[model samples]
Target: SKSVLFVCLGNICRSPIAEAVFRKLVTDEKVSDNWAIDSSAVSDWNVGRPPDPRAVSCLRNHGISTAHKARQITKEDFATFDYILCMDESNLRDLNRKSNQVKNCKAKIELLGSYDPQKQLIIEDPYYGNDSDFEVVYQQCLRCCKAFLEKTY
Candidate 1:
């Protein structure tokens, strides 16, 4: 089984949603035991808090529940997770910096959409957008998660 860590600027928004969305898909596919999913922030903001209420509600609307409290990515995660997926290129850079500097985890860091190369884009932060933004994010996450499973597992 492979363990994965999804990362963004803050765990409150994108990563948490990614984790929940991916979990639901894997569970529905009855492949839950084949992988473990986790998400965290690349930045220190929003640490020790639950996911943004909007994010939680959005996930719930999609029939997925996210009970994750916010957490920041750590050096040890490099040694723990088989893959570390970032929401965008900027985040991938941050992850690479931390992982290489401290955890020697450079190679495992990558963009989430890299699994779905067709996207050729990043998962945008929807913090300032309306409720529908969450739904859009959920769809992107689902697409990428399925691709990741097919590619790595």
Candidate 2:
């Protein structure tokens, strides 16, 4: 089974949104069972909390349901997931450093935005921003997830 772990500074914002978006995309295609998808944070902050309210609202505005609890990335994640996709450069650096601690890491760590057709290289954090920022994240995730799903499938 193919598996992916979307990551960010905190699981509540971008990563959760990406996770939900990708899950919805795959679910729509009726191929959800063929993959294992989830999200995590580089920081322990917000580790058990639900996704930020703005993110939830933005997703719901687009008819995508958001249900997520934040979790910090772990060594096990580096070994188990096929892809470890993150939101930005900071996340990429953090994940790379963490993956280095786990010997023989199996996952490929890359920016989720690398798959975006628009050529946006980083999915900015929307945590401190308003609904408009969340909306940007929604659109970016939609585009990247669609392209990623198309390529992966």
Candidate 3:
């Protein structure tokens, strides 16, 4: 019974992939009911928007469906989740800064890629890249999610 919050800049691209990937992994393990997972953004823009088309396409290729709406990270998130894994150093920095201000802060914030066996410490933002770039994000998320669930539970 643990939870994670995947966060990126806008919650439209990378974070959604990570969130959905985690769901798939847990469902396969037959422990979906034991885990709570979601994703959000550091930036406030793009709130309420669905995922980027490229992100949607990439996920569909891998048997994952992204049902997400962009939402900004909340202070309450810091206290609710067991982990808050992010995409890049900037996301890393801001989440920690925000965590300190949270009264009930409990999450351990780190790069989602920190669990990556590929040694890709940062899951690059594919917002400006091509469709193939979204595939790269999907792969990274899959690897990270696989390793994370193994390390957890």
Candidate 4:
């Protein structure tokens, strides 16, 4: 399967939402079997947690249930996924660094926003912000994921 790794500083927030959003997109479009999607933290924090509460609520609002145990990106991931999609440039840089030094990951490491030709923006962390911010991030992820699915499939 073609795989995508959604990444952020911590798996608890942005990336988890991205993973959830994208998974929902692929499933609803009847393309889930064609693509594998997951999320990870760039660092070791929150390695055993689930997605953020606000993120969960955001997805649930769209009638989608989010499921994931947070994890850190591993050497195996580089060889496992076709795309390492970052929530921000920071995560992208860190992913590249890790992939370069440890995983030999030469696969594409890019921002999820890049797929949105109309509005390519970093997914802002909403952990400390209001619920509305989380909603915006969720919406962006949906748009980007749909566009990305179109291009890749």
Candidate 5:
């Protein structure tokens, strides 16, 4: 099975949304069994916590279900996941730095928004913003995840 990990500064915001969107895409394609999908954070601020309520509600409006709790990226994850797709350049830099510390690093890290057909190169963080911000993120994730799944499968 192919595995992908979605990541952000805090798992409570953008990453969980991307993870849910991608999982729904694969399930709709009836290819869920071929994939192992999850999300995590670069920081420990929200570890073990559910995603932001705004994010959760935004996803629900699109008929998506999310069951993830926040988790910080680990050294083991570097070797376990096939692809580690993150939200922005800050996340990419932090992930690269962390990956370099792990001798067994094997995952390919990239920006998730890079797959967006609309050319959005970064998925902005909605942590401090209002519900409208979460909605924007939801839309971006929808577009990007669809393209990513198409490219991967």
Candidate 6:
């Protein structure tokens, strides 16, 4: 089975949404059982907490849902996941540094937006933004995650 980890600074705004969106895509393809999908944080600030309310509602707008809670990335993630996709360049850097700490690190870390067909290279953080911004993120992730899945399978 293949594994993927979505990551962001807080695991509240972007990563969980990406994770859920990706899960939905894979399930739509009837391949969820073949994939391991999860999300985590580059920081521990929101560790063990539920995703932001706005994020949860945003996913529900499309009939998608998740029980995911915030978590910091672990060294084992580097060794276990086949892909480690993150929200932005800052997350990419942090993950790169963290991956070095794991001797068996093997995941291919990249920006989730790298898979965007429209060429968006960063998944914008919506923490300070309003509902509309969350929708923007949802749309971006929908496109990017779809593109990623299409390319992968």
Candidates in order have lDDT scores of: 0.84, 0.91, 0.92, 0.83, 0.92, 0.92
Candidate 1 overall lDDT versus native: 0.84
Residue runs of model 5 more than 4 Å from their true location after superposition:
none
Off by over 4 Å in 2: none
| Candidate 3 lDDT trough over 10 residues, lowest sum | 59-68
TM-score of each: 0.91, 0.97, 0.97, 0.93, 0.97, 0.97
lDDT of 6 by residue, 46-146 (tens): 99999999999999999999999899999989999999999888999999898878899889999989998999899889999999999999999999889
Task: Write down the lDDT that model 5 would get.
Answer: 0.92
In model 3, the runs with Cα more than 4 Å from the true position are none
lDDT of 2 by residue, 64-124 (tens): 8766899999899998999999999988988888887998799999999999999998999
Clashes of 6: 0
Give one digit per residue, the lDDT tens place, for model 5 in 9-114.
9899899999998899889889999999999999999899999888889988999879899999999999999999999999999999999999898899999989
Task: Output the lDDT of residue 12, model 1.
Answer: 87
Candidate 6 error regions (>4 Å): none
C-alpha root-mean-square deviation, candidate 2: 0.8
Per-residue lDDT over 12-104 for candidate 4, one digit per residue giving the tens place of the 0 to 100 score = 878888888888887887878988788888888788998888888888888877769889888888887889888887877787778767636
Mark the 10 consecutive residues where model 6 has the least summed lDDT: 144-153
Candidate 1 regions exceeding 4 Å error are none
- On lDDT, the stronger of 4 and 5 is 5
